[PDB]
Amino acid sequence: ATIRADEISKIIRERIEGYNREVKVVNTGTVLQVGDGIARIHGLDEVMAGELVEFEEGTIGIALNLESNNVG
Amino acid sequence: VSRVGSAAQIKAMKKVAGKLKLELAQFAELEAFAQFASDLDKATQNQLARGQRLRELLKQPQSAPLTVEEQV
Amino acid sequence: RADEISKIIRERIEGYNREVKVVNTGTVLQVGDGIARIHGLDEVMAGELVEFEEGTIGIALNLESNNVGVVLMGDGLMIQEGSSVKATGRIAQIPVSEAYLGRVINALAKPIDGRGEITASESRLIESPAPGIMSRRSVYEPLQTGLIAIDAMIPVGRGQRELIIGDRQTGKTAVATDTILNQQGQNVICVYVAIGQKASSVAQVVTNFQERGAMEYTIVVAETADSPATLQYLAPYTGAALAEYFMYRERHTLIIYDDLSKQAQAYRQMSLLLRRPPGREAYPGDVFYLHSRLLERAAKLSSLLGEGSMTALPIVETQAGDVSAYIPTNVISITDGQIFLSADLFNAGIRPAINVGISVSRVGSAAQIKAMKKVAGKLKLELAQFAELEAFAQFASDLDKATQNQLARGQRLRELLKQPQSAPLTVEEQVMTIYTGTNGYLDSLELDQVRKYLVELRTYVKTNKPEFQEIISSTKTFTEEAEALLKEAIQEQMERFLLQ
Amino acid sequence: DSTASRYASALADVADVTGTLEATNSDVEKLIRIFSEEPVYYFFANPVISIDNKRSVLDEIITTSGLQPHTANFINILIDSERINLVKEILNEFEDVFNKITGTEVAVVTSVVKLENDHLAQIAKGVQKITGAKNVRIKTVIDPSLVAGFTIRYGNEGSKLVDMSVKKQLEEIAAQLEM
Amino acid sequence: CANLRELRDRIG
Amino acid sequence: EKKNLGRIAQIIGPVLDVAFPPGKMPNIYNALIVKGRDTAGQPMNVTCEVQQLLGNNRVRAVAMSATDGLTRGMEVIDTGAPLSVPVGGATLGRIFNVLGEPVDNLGPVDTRTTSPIHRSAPAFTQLDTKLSIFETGIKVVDLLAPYRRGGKIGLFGGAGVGKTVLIMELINNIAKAHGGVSVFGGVGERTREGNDLYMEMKESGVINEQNIAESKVALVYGQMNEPPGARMRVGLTALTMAEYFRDVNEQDVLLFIDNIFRFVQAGSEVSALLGRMPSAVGYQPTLSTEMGSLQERITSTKEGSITSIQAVYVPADDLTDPAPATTFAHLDATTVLSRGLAAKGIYPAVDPLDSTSTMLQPRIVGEEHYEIAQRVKETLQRYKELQDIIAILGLDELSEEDRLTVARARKIERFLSQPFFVAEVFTGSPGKYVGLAETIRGFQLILSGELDSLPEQAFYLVGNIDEATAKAMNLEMESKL
Amino acid sequence: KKNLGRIAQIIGPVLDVAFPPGKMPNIYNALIVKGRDTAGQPMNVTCEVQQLLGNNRVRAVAMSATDGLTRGMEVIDTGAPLSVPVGGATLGRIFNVLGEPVDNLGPVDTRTTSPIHRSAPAFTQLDTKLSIFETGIKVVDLLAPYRRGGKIGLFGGAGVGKTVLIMELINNIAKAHGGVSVFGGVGERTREGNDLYMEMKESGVINEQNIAESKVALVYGQMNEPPGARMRVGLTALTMAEYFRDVNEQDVLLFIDNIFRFVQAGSEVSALLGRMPSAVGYQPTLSTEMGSLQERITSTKEGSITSIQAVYVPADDLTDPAPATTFAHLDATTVLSRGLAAKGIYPAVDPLDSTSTMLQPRIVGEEHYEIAQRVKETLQRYKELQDIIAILGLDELSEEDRLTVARARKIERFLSQPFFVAEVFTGSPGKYVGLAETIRGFQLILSGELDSLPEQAFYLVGNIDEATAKAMNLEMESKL
Ligand SMILES: Nc1ncnc2c1ncn2[C@@H]1O[C@H](COP(=O)(O)OP(=O)(O)OP(=O)(O)O)[C@@H](O)[C@H]1O
Ligand SMILES: Nc1ncnc2c1ncn2[C@@H]1O[C@H](COP(=O)(O)OP(=O)(O)O)[C@@H](O)[C@H]1O
């Protein structure tokens, strides 16, 4: 995708502070593009396909389709 | 339909039955229109008979070769 | 004068002195066969028509982030993909004046007849907010459409946007022209915009107007086929901006569009080129918004605004005679009623082919004058009863005399309805016609001779009883003297018609 | 925005949060001068070339020109993801984003002849006053199109344009037609 | 429409 | 809320994609006004709401007014909350557009109290149990096809059939008999018909031009001029303006949402504009969800009922396609206004036979009401059948066990016609409100067999059945002369 | 010119070429590609620029086959919008869309070449003289008269007519018209193009002995050409006709066959071009392209381009966009129906649907107008009684309406015609019958004076006198 969901300026700042540096984010992710009931979360590499991810307000989400960077 | 017409038939075929396509496609209308009938004259009572005997003779059992005279 | 002509040039040469303004100027990324996805125009309002280095003016609709996607109002062959295109502070306006009366124009409001160049200092913006509900009023006065079918059973009052919708080739253009040709004694400035119609048909219509003499007051905004997509899109709005001026200056008007299906087709063109997501039938997102924006600016203004009235009368060409398609159902939801010109009733000899049934009018009898309010009531009732008894049309075999008389009178009433081509029936004649038909006074004649009898009766009346003219034109109520005069005239004409 | 503008804004935010801004801009100029000259651009594109070889030659071309460390990580991430084929456009829009963040705005003055530095600084005063930028940068281009004076192409990207030039006689003859 | 128009004709 | 200045990055037609600083972002449906500049030289501000988020701080927002003249980079200001609608006793009489500014030019409305448009649903504990009949005051509706208070109601009949006098009667009878007020919620209302309705109101005493805040209607007119985001949200604007009435005065409210198919049409328009891939026949994918969000806040909360009356216009006349399907999945009483009956003059033109309601069942209405309603529907079925044959045989030739049926059928068909508190401006009849008990006993007396001697035109345009006997006794007095 | 191109991508027939930045061709600018052939080095395939993509590359549709083109092949822009050779030299030769001779005779001269995609004629100069036309066909001279110097449309299903009718119409008129005819095989099948070329050269129209004399000038962009070619062979025919109407001052008669190909090829290229799909599958700019063809056909005070486009209705979808946009442009439309062909009534012209704006009475003659109205009304009554007849039996209707049914049968069979070019399909010789003769026939048919003849006596008959003779023939054959 030319406009990938993992292309927010703040998000790529997080990756550009360290290229091949200190161990990645384990379980903390900033939600982005929370639109049609489908929030694309950056990070969360420990998420099992089908996880029960919680949000800030307290709205539960199933992590069905999780791509290379965004765990949608 | 045939877009080449009877120009792609033998002279015998065009002589014996070249008007056969239109005559028969016309008989189809007179058949579908005189299925329901009242006070049919002799013109219709004999024209439908001719058209019936003109439809009934195309019943080729497959894989049986008919030489050109056997159609003429 | 051989050098005085060049001396005239010195006036403007010394006049224009060119203060330093800001022109929003960006480069052209992409010319897309009608669209020019120019880049860099930041402070350009959505709708400012831009002008290129080659004078190919075009409107800027699709303002994406990194490329303002403009559409070209001309044949854009000369754009060079790098020619710096400048913006203009214009918001797609057109000049408007009284002197447009009679000269056919394009969407640029530039005269295409060529027999002059109209001057104008007043300019009405082509898109504009429609009359608000504080200013709009209810429909009082009727617009005589010249047809008995669309002025007795289904009226069209001034300010009501009826809909001439029907099958392909049924008489929509001919009925709209019959209305514009009748609208001669009255003061309505009838603007007839033609979208996508061929050049030859627009020539035939303008020469018909000039032959009938009704071209004194008719701006035929003409959009030929090879005219680009933007002009076939903009033409209804151009005619609307002319008629809105003529309405806001107290003059009742009548704007008759042509092929709103073709207008929406041109919008489909320019949007799908501009890459806007398509809805049903591939028509773009805002079709309904579009048709409303040019079609809901047509109504009667109030007393404090000037009493004027823009009475739209669109023509929506629907194929296979249906209303299920996107454009006909949208414009039917927008328009106060509709008339259905059916090709079956057209080929069956009923000209105009106005469907007497489903073709409802939302205003109802509030638009008709008192004479019509009295007579067309019985006409509508008897046509309803005849349409109910249309199944017994041939099978009425010596049946009850109520049935037989009612069916015969209905059969005669539909030949009252049908009327010749471009024949305008001034109300003073059509009231007497509908009366003569609905009160059995022509039950004696067969189905064939009703037309000849009625033409001869109308001639004899309008030549030998001119008090009926005073009554119907001035008093506008079918009172006792007019009724008795009409009865006596019918009797005398029936006698001399029997004498043949 | 565009993807290139997003990457440029990332690099500009880094040049902000780390005190290496002007060095970052000079390094980006060096880097776009590098990623011109089609052979090297085609080398960093054309994904058949192994990623290890690509990043190794990247390390070498960093340690040759001596770029800032963070912009080296930036181009390395560009190679890591499959969006390296945009690198020229990214480095191109970096001038836009860097200037917008730093507060400098570019004004392109096009004159028939070379414009003197004092009057160029006066034009800088004017553009600075009308726009509201700190250190307005005037990159002049000698053009034979005009006749007498200058055009100012200040703004976001070309958008605003003021000029005393051949546009004068152009408007004169065009509104002289008046038809 | 050769599918819808035929059914409109049949319903008529 | 905050000076959340962003730039209006992309403006495609009506949809205007605005960007925002990375700190603060307006969430979905959070209205935002842009500090726009018109071509004329006045700073008119066209309001918008965030229909969709697109991730890179750019919230795709649809406009409540024309976008002709919005430069990119214009200051867009967040409100922090959905579109504030000026609810209250103040908004009782004036006309409103979607953003909540009176367009009837009378004056400003007290914005001291305002509720957001997109307040969520009521709760399971807050919903009411008893399926309570809603006494309208029309004999036809109250007998044959009752309306559910807190439910939904469909007026299938078009305009020209008498829909405007019917809704005016319903509003005036709500203000007279019940304690509540109504809210006409015209969604995509053709402006000519809008001014028609407004003048009919002002001349029918429904709203007083001399006395506002004493009137009985909260007009919300979303004209079809306005962009698709506007006439879509006009339904929800009327809904919250009526929900304030419900949950603040505990009174029965009526929503006369104009034909729902325009609301679903506007939803399709705005979704095709947002580019979200279209669903079946062409309405939005979130058709069920959106129309349910419009018609689920129509519920009789413990505070008070908010029963609505929603015209429905089937396209191409099918119950099959999704928009009428998803609407009729919600309606609780469907009453069609019949054009032929209107032309006859049996006002109100509501068709007694084809109209139906889910409330009609005996456990809901009453066993005697269900019995008399089913018997009246069977009698009118018998008359619709024998209308064929009374032309051929005559009223005398056919059997005199069903000549009684035809006679009582004429009596019922006339007795269903009721003079209205609104028709006084046209004809001069005073107007009678008929309770449910009164029309029940009247129809029981008509159909049981007592009043087989009263003339047929004594039941026409009369209220209670004793008033019909009074009409017949007056005709008997005048029979000698 | 000299601006080398270096073609970047070749996605099917649409190839986009990355020009240098300063030197970029305009839209609709011919691009001869100096490319290799399958065998051998030299080959010139032509392309016209359709849009400028803005990455220094422009999208161009291919006029020749797209096979054999290399990514990186040199290509120059001509700077001239695909000029086509016209004049006295174009008479007699079959022309490609490129503007070349296809008949392997001596090549044409380039003395009077003309651009192919030019602006429309302005409305200020439009000759509108309404004059009826006598083609020769009974029905479409009576039921739907044609406008001389005006567009005419032979709509129809796939194979109902519209090419045998075009052949008979050219066989009739192309001799009579002093001005030449410019037949355009826009996406027509090649074998019918062969038949038309042979029929022209045998009918003295081509005059193979003196090729420079012919009253016809063909262009073939026939069915087997790349979608670029069918997109513009209509414009080639239009350019030849527009030259013969702008300069030679003679009224010309262009026959375009299957104008629907001019829209379908536009569809196949617009799909690849990047333009979004419209309704049922055609291009977005269907209407503007169709108008760009149809508007250039107008009588313009220097002559009169009468034209008969054999529009193809896609599977008789008479509501489809491709005929729905052409109905607006076509004056004397003529909808041919498969329904009235399946029963053998040829030509398959519908009596009802085929309508013309030359059936106004003051234009066509009062008695002719009245006969046309009565024929159309009788056929409409028959089409309305088709439901009662088919279900409830022929007898269950009235005995005056039965006379109207038999009269409608007589009429709809009498408006059959033996064409001269359709003798190979009929087997019977052709009879050319004038206008006044068919009026005099219909008067006696629907006046009830001769309702005794058998229905087959009115089938495939030239004139009413030949119908009377066939009645005698049939009554003798009945007993014999
Ligand atoms: N009263 C009438 N008498 C005779 N002919 C009529 C009458 N009304 C309409 N017509 C016929 O209608 C035809 C023209 O109608 P019209 O131009 O509306 O068809 P159309 O093709 O649908 O219009 P458009 O080109 O705008 O779509 C003429 O051929 C004319 O014969
Ligand atoms: N007058 C006629 N007599 C007999 N057959 C005909 C006649 N007219 C048309 N046909 C048949 O119908 C077909 C229609 O012509 P055709 O060339 O198929 O049209 P298209 O070019 O649209 O396919 C012809 O091929 C022919 O076989």
Set out the domains of chain F in order of their start, with CATH numbers. Answer: 2-82 (2.40.10.170), 83-359 (3.40.50.300), 360-479 (1.10.1140.10)
Ligand 2 and G133: CB distance under 6 A:
no
Residues of F in contact with D1 (CB under 8 A): 9, 19, 56, 58
One domain for residues C326 and C438 = no
Q: Contact, G175 vs G205, CB < 8 A?
A: yes
> What is the extent of the structural domain holding C464?
369-497
For residue G360, which of G155, G145, G148, G152 has the smallest C-alpha distance?
G145
Which CATH number characterizes residue C437's domain?
A: 1.20.150.20
Contacts with C179 (C-beta within 8 Å, 6 or more apart), sequence order = C143, C145, C146, C147, C190, C254, C256, C313
**Of D80, D103, D126, at which residue does a domain stop?**
D103
DSSP sequence for C367-381 = SS-HHHHHHHHHHHH
Residues of D in contact with A12 (CB under 8 A): 6-7, 10, 77
C3, two tokens? 């050098």
Using the Cβ of D2 and the Cβ atoms of chain F, whether some distance falls under 8 Å is answered with no
Q: Is C172 annotated as a binding residue?
A: yes
> What is the extent of the structural domain holding D171?
104-179
Ligand 2 and G426: CB distance under 6 A:
yes
For residue C171, which of C406, C16, C341, C420 has the smallest C-alpha distance?
C341
G276, two tokens? 């979004």
Contacts with B69 (C-beta within 8 Å, 6 or more apart), sequence order = none
Ligand 1 and C258: CB distance under 6 A:
yes
Q: What is the rounded CA–CA span in Å between residue F149 and residue F180?
A: 12
Q: Contact, C330 vs C288, CB < 8 A?
A: yes
**F68, F227, F268 ranked by CB distance to C127: nearest:** F68
For residue C147, which of C433, C489, C450 has the smallest C-alpha distance?
C433
Please report, as a single letter, which amino acid is at residue F292: G
Surface-to-core class of residue D22, CB atoms within 10 Å of its CB (0-12 exposed, 13-18 middle, 19+ buried): exposed
Surface-to-core class of residue G111, CB atoms within 10 Å of its CB (0-12 exposed, 13-18 middle, 19+ buried): exposed
Task: Give helix B20-34 / helix B42-55 axis angle, nearest 10°.
Answer: 120
| Chain Cα centroid distance, residue C429 | 24
Q: What is the rounded CA–CA span in Å between residue F293 and residue F264?
A: 12
One domain for residues C251 and C274 = yes
Q: How far is the CA of C342 from the centre of ligand 1 (A)?
A: 12
Q: What is the rounded CA–CA span in Å between residue C214 and residue C146?
A: 14
Using the Cβ of G334 and the Cβ atoms of chain C, whether some distance falls under 8 Å is answered with no
One domain for residues D96 and D126 = no
For residue F187, list its beta bridge partners: F222
Quote the number of domains for chain C: 3
| Choice among G48, G168, G188, G466 that is catalytic | G188
Helix (H, G, I), strand (E, B) or coil at G225: coil
One domain for residues D160 and D109 = yes
One domain for residues C389 and C485 = yes
Query: How open is the CA angle D121-D124-D125, to the nearest 5 degrees?
Result: 95
Ligand 1 and C174: CB distance under 6 A:
yes
Q: What is the rounded CA–CA span in Å between residue C66 and residue A3?
A: 14
Select the residue from F18, F56, F57, F59 to test the D interface by mutation, using most D Cβ atoms within 10 A. Answer: F56
Helix (H, G, I), strand (E, B) or coil at G216: strand
One domain for residues C477 and C377 = yes
For residue G132, which of G118, G124, G143 has the smallest C-alpha distance?
G143
**Of C318, C345, C368, at which residue does a domain stop?**
C368
Task: Give helix G366-392 / helix G435-446 axis angle, nearest 10°.
Answer: 50
Cα–Cα distances (Å) from B46 to A24, D97, F481, G469, in that order, read: 95, 93, 78, 21
**Resolution given for this structure, in angstroms:** 4.0
**G159, G343, G455 ranked by CB distance to B25: nearest:** G343
**D10, D70, D76 ranked by CB distance to A12: nearest:** D10
Helix (H, G, I), strand (E, B) or coil at C491: helix
**G26, G355, G381 ranked by CB distance to C169: nearest:** G355
DSSP sequence for C38-80 = EE---S--TT--EE-TT---EEEEEE-SS-EEEEESS--TT--
One domain for residues C25 and C127 = no
- The DSSP bridge pattern shows strands G44-52 and G30-34 to be antiparallel
One domain for residues C147 and C200 = yes
Contacts with F151 (C-beta within 8 Å, 6 or more apart), sequence order = F134, F298, F300, F307, F332, F333, F359
Q: What is the rounded CA–CA span in Å between residue F433 and residue F76?
A: 52
Q: What is the rounded CA–CA span in Å between residue G174 and residue G169?
A: 8
Helix (H) or strand (E) holding F33: strand F31-34
For residue F52, list its beta bridge partners: F60
Please report, as a single letter, which amino acid is at residue C290: L
**Of C90, C114, C131, at which residue does a domain stop?**
C90
Which CATH number characterizes residue C72's domain?
A: 2.40.30.20
Q: Is residue C180 part of a domain?
A: yes
Whether the bond between G347 and the residue before it is cis, its omega within 30 degrees of 0, is yes
Surface-to-core class of residue C439, CB atoms within 10 Å of its CB (0-12 exposed, 13-18 middle, 19+ buried): middle
The technique by which this structure was obtained is cryo-EM
- Ligand 1: nearest atom to the Cα of G327: 21
**Of C90, C123, C151, at which residue does a domain stop?**
C90
- From the CA of G369, the nearest ligand is 1
- From the CA of G139, the nearest ligand is 2
Helix (H, G, I), strand (E, B) or coil at D110: strand
For residue G74, which of G41, G27, G116, G26 has the smallest C-alpha distance?
G41
One domain for residues D154 and D108 = yes
Q: What is the rounded CA–CA span in Å between residue G316 and residue G156?
A: 7
CA-based Rg of chain C, rounded to a whole angstrom? 26
* Cβ pairs bridging E and G (under 8 Å): 9
Query: How open is the CA angle C378-C381-C382, to the nearest 5 degrees?
Result: 85
Q: How many helices and strands in chain B, by DSSP H and E?
A: 4, 0
One domain for residues C32 and C127 = no
Identify the DSSP state of G275: P
Quote the number of domains for chain D: 2
| Choice among C275, C280, C362, C496 that is catalytic | C362
Annotated binding-site residues of G read: 156-163
Residue of chain D whose alpha carbon sits nearest to that of F55: D1
One domain for residues D95 and D120 = no
Query: How open is the CA angle F328-F331-F333, to the nearest 5 degrees?
Result: 120
Please report, as a single letter, which amino acid is at residue F13: G
One domain for residues D158 and D117 = yes
- The DSSP bridge pattern shows strands G113-114 and G84-85 to be antiparallel
* Residue G428, CA atoms < 13 Å, CB-side half-sphere: 18
One domain for residues D13 and D64 = yes
Contacts with F362 (C-beta within 8 Å, 6 or more apart), sequence order = F369, F370, F371
Q: How far is the CA of G433 from the centre of ligand 2 (A)?
A: 20
Q: Contact, G183 vs G218, CB < 8 A?
A: yes
For residue G88, which of G212, G171, G241, G185 has the smallest C-alpha distance?
G212
Identify the DSSP state of G119: P
Ligand 1 and C418: CB distance under 6 A:
no
One domain for residues C414 and C273 = no
One domain for residues C169 and C307 = yes
One domain for residues D111 and D62 = no
Cα–Cα distances (Å) from C128 to C49, C93, C94, C251, C495, in that order, read: 16, 10, 12, 19, 59
For residue F163, which of F295, F350, F344, F331 has the smallest C-alpha distance?
F350
In D40-174, the DSSP E strands lie at: 106-107, 109-111, 137-138, 141-142, 150-152, 162-164
Can you give the length of chain B in residues?
72
- Ligand 1: nearest atom to the Cα of C173: 18
| Choice among F135, F189, F226, F290 that is catalytic | F189
Q: What is the rounded CA–CA span in Å between residue C127 and residue F227?
A: 14
Provide the chain G residues 299-358 that lie in CB contact (below 8 A) with chain E: 315-320
Mutate to test the pocket of ligand 1, among C168, C170, C339 (most ligand atoms within 8 A of CB): C170
Q: What is the rounded CA–CA span in Å between residue D38 and residue D30?
A: 15
Surface-to-core class of residue D92, CB atoms within 10 Å of its CB (0-12 exposed, 13-18 middle, 19+ buried): middle
Question: What number of other Cβ atoms are within 10 A of residue F365's Cβ?
Answer: 22
Q: What is the rounded CA–CA span in Å between residue C96 and residue C105?
A: 12
Helix (H, G, I), strand (E, B) or coil at F420: coil
One domain for residues C484 and C463 = yes
| Chain Cα centroid distance, residue G338 | 18
Tell me, yes or no, if G188 is annotated catalytic: yes
Using the Cβ of G198 and the Cβ atoms of chain B, whether some distance falls under 8 Å is answered with no
